[PDB]
């Protein structure tokens, strides 16, 4: 039932945002899940029976003790690992503005599918190195957004070096974002320096693929290094797992990896077709 799903997402996004501005976001969220109705039905009743996987919806499901997808969200993209492992090593790095940054680096090859609402990609990477990104998407901005996420996730020093101011991004409670989301917010604001300094390479013009230049125009001849746009589309089930959620709505899998947080919830939403009554 897609009207319910879409109304559920809208309600869930609104609730997660409001619960973020409190001394106990988990407690606030749960209260709001219990006090909110959609089409005249309590949200908890819908969450318990609705299969939608969306970041705010899954934060609410975790708060209620319900299983969600085992995939993590970064930059709005659901990352499903298809190779390599999760083990990471801390490193202090230095941005292009001479600000230090403590990041957690996986060593060794990994491979992911990135599934977004407006783009899909295959990401192959090694230690602090983008090997390949193959991305398809609905429009130029949506592909650019996937490319930015993938460059940040790569943790390549070219990307750290392209940072051009101090990084003091916060959430809705004015609490500072973690290092990778600092980097994500910076380049989401303006990616020109990152794209211009990343590097380009000649491409083999092959059917269904096209290059993409640092100014985000398609090219048959060159492309951002390691990046290709799929005109035919990248292909893409849900493993549902028991999760935990802490006071600040950070959701973790059994091994302690963070899957979701309020920072992974879209800032936009549709228009509900079922009436949502809050409180």
């Amino acid at each position, epitope marked *: 039932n897609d009207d319910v799903d*879409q109304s559920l997402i809208i309600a869930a996004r609104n609730i997660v945002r409001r619960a973020t501005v409190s001394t106990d976001p988990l407690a606030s969220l749960l209260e709001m899940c219990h006090s909110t109705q959609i089409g005249g039905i309590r949200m908890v009743d819908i969450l318990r029976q609705n299969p939608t996987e969306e970041q705010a919806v899954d934060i609410c499901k975790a708060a209620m003790g319900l299983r969600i997808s085992s995939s993590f969200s970064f930059g709005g993209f659901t990352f499903k690992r298809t190779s390599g492992s999760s083990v990471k090593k801390e490193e202090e790095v230095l941005t292009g503005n001479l600000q230090t940054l403590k990041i957690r680096v996986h060593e060794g090859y990994e491979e992911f599918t990135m599934v977004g*609402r*407006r783009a899909t990609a295959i990401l192959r990477k090694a230690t602090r190195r983008l090997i390949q990104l193959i991305v*398809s*998407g*609905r*429009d*130029e*901005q*949506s*592909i650019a957004e996937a490319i930015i996420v993938a460059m940040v996730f790569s943790q390549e020093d070219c990307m750290i070096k392209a940072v051009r101011g101090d990084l003091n991004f916060v959430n809705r409670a004015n609490q500072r974002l973690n290092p990778m989301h600092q980097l994500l917010r910076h380049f989401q604001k303006d990616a020109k320096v990152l794209f211009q300094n990343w590097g380009i390479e000649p491409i083999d013009n092959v059917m269904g693929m*096209i290059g993409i230049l640092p100014d985000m125009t*398609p090219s048959t001849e060159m492309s951002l290094r390691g990046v290709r*746009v*799929s*005109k*035919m*589309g990248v292909d893409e089930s849900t493993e549902r797992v028991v999760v935990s959620i802490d006071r600040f709505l950070r959701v973790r899998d059994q091994r302690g990896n963070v899957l979701l947080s309020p920072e992974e919830v*879209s800032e*936009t*939403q*549709g*228009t*509900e*077709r079922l009436t949502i009554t809050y409180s």
Partner: nanobody
Amino acid sequence: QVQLQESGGGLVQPGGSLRLSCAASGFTFKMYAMSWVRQAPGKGLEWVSSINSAGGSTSYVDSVKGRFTISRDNAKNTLYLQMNSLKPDDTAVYYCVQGRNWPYDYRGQGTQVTVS
């Protein structure tokens, strides 16, 4: 000889409705996903909605979700966009395109929509 021709734009008031049409020709329409994209004042080409070949599965940008409905009549080689609860920010030239992946090789001439 792929040809796309949009129809149905106009000047309307907030809260109003319009129905865009796009007649396709020069390809087997039934075998292609189709999309609507738009160019609002000051901006680039932004995707609005996609629909698969059979018509059963649809996708929308958040800003139109719950207000716009994409549909298609494969018998008549026509793509539609029902725009309800129109807002000033829906002002744009609306284009029909083949497929659902950017960059779009085939785009119509556009139909202007102005909500004021």
